[PDB]
Design a protein around this ligand. Structure first.
Ligand code: NA
Length: 129
């Protein structure tokens, strides 16, 4: 599924991500824009052979099991395939664990490089929320 901007903002809010760990909803929308372009089926292979999955490009190194990342953990206790669903519940639940891990949203390198410090409210501007 390819979400619209305000449609994803609404889905993230419904799943309790708005101001989760003090990150406003525009921070989450901005991260999703630059990680996946709002596509739940987004995948990206890393040079180390881990893979990033879904709207927030969650990595198999630590967070999900894909059976092909030697030495990796599955700290969200999910198959990485669950992160590709039209239903964002698994991605949101896992992102809550990631952003609690100690470096906040810096875990998302696209957030640090493209969202952090910017006018992230623009990402929810005009949305009925
Ligand atoms: Na893994």
């Amino acid at each position: 599924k390819v979400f619209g901007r305000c449609e994803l903002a609404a889905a993230m809010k419904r799943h309790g991500l708005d101001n989760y760990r003090g990150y406003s909803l525009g921070n989450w929308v901005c991260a999703a824009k630059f990680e996946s372009n709002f596509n739940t089926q987004a995948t990206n292979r890393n040079t180390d052979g881990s893979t990033d999955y879904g709207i927030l490009q969650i990595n198999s190194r630590w967070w999900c099991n894909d059976g092909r990342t030697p030495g990796s953990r599955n700290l969200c206790n999910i198959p990485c395939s669950a992160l590709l669903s039209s239903d964002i519940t698994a991605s949101v639940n896992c992102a809550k664990k990631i952003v609690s891990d100690g470096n906040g949203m810096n875990a998302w390198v696209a957030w640090r490089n493209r969202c952090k410090g910017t006018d992230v409210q623009a990402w929810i501007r005009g949305c009925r929320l």
